[PDB]
């Protein structure tokens, strides 16, 4: 099939600034004089919008900031004074050959200056141990930019197993990114030990935040 | 006005089937090519099929080549997905979208998209959710602001809704997407208040998931 490869995955942009994401095909996406290839935009939990189709032509209700041209394999979308209803997913799309595909996407995201996390960790609660289970959760709230990692210690080493993540999208008040990580262990094993540790790594810091509670309390 | 509603989604047992169906509503249906079109969840768009205006050509995307059948009813206009044989990759929110012509017909483009339905293959029974309070320690709390959360564990089916406090407390919070381990589903929620209000206040969290008819109002109380 043919394959779309967008980039970057993700752009972290100014509002007023000038946007330029690009979209490249495994194989030529030109037909008789023309391409086959379409910008569609999309917001959470919402279905796409088109933005352009033919590889230049703006859809007709789009703002003149957005533009679109290439061909062959190369394409690309413009929204040069980029604002706050631009905010959002933006995918490429052929119709060459079939299966008709889609690119990957790119996430368009407020950029912002760096945060640290705030780290939060929380033993199992009583009603959990009850039903022979023990999860930890610990929380890394509003951080930026996106990328973090999170790694457990139990009483001294990293444990791998059972350990579940999630993040919130990017926050429409402060601009920043949170996770949630959970550790679940069954109640015995969580008490054949005495130290949980929630580590986070993040950009602003090259020392890991470190945040853990000890048992017996 | 132009609009495509989907409807048919739902839960189905892997190797069950289940029939989509899509309501146009402003245009001449009887000339406009159809598609479906289908999204995972986290995951990218997948074309899954295409009919003519004219039922003339269908196309089916490999992945549901011998499973799925598309068809179309010009009278009533609507466009119409049978699913069977489904498994656990058929998991996704199932668009409904009109192709159209800029110079003609092979230049064709997606031009209207629907909200479309969900559809969820699975083995898993309705199970309401664990709510497990997550309080801090006595003296492991320091500064001024404290963060304590809600633990919402293996629940079937999606969604579930959190609050705290009702709503009084909208600010600083953050309720995680859920994330299916096994196949069951398991979220949680943070919310973040001053110190001098906690243990001296409650704090509740109110999670509500309709499938069980369940709501729980979890009081997050200090550990001894």
């Known amino acids: 099939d043919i394959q779309l490869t967008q980039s970057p995955a993700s752009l972290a942009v100014s509002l007023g600034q000038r946007v330029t994401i690009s979209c490249r095909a495994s194989?030529?996406?030109?037909?008789?004089?023309?391409?086959?290839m379409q910008w569609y935009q999309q917001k959470p939990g919402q279905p796409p919008k088109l933005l352009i189709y033919?590889?230049?032509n703006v859809e007709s209700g789009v703002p003149a900031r957005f533009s679109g041209s290439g061909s062959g394999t190369d394409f690309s979308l413009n929204i040069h004074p980029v604002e706050e209803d631009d905010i959002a997913m933006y995918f490429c799309?052929?119709?060459?050959?079939?299966?008709?595909?889609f690119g990957g996407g790119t996430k368009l995201e407020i950029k912002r200056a760096d945060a640290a996390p705030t780290v939060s960790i929380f033993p199992p609660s009583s009603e959990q141990l009850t039903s022979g289970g023990a999860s930890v959760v610990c929380f890394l709230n509003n951080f930026y930019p996106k990328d973090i990692n999170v790694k457990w210690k139990i009483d001294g080493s990293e444990r791998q197993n059972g350990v579940l993540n999630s993040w919130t999208d990017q926050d429409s008040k402060d601009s920043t990114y949170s996770m949630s990580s959970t550790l679940t262990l069954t109640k015995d094993e969580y008490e054949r030990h005495n130290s949980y540790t929630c580590e986070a790594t993040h950009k602003t810091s090259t020392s890991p935040i470190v945040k853990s509670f000890n048992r017996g309390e | 006005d132009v609009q495509l509603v989907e409807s048919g989604g739902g839960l189905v047992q892997p190797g069950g089937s289940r029939k989509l169906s899509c309501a146009a509503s402003?245009?001449?249906?009887?000339?406009?090519?159809m598609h479906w079109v289908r999204q995972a969840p986290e995951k990218g768009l997948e074309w899954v099929a295409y009919?003519?205006?004219?039922?003339?050509?269908?196309y089916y995307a490999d992945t549901v080549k011998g499973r799925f059948t598309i068809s179309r009813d010009n009278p009533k206009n609507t466009l119409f997905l049978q699913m069977t044989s489904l498994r656990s990759e058929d998991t996704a929110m199932y668009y409904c979208?009109?192709?159209?012509?800029?110079?003609?017909?092979?230049?064709?483009?997606?031009?209207?998209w629907g909200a479309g339905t969900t559809v969820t293959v699975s083995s898993a029974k309705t199970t309401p959710p664990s709510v497990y309070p997550l309080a801090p320690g006595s003296a492991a709390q320091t500064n001024s602001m404290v963060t304590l959360g809600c633990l919402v564990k293996g629940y079937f089916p999606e969604p579930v809704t959190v609050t705290w406090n009702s709503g009084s407390l909208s600010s600083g919070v953050h309720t995680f997407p859920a994330v299916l381990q096994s196949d069951l589903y398991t979220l949680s929620s943070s919310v973040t208040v001053p110190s001098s209000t906690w243990p001296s206040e409650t704090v509740t969290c109110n999670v509500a998931h309709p499938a069980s008819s369940t709501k729980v109002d979890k009081k997050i109380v200090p550990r001894d």
């Open positions: 194989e030529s996406v030109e037909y008789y004089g023309s391409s086959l």
């Open positions: 402003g245009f001449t249906f009887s000339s406009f090519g």
């Open positions: 033919a590889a230049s």
């Open positions: 979208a009109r192709s159209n012509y800029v110079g003609y017909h092979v230049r064709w483009y997606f031009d209207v």
């Open positions: 009919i003519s205006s004219d039922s003339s050509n269908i």
């Open positions: 799309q052929q119709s060459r050959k079939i299966p008709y595909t």
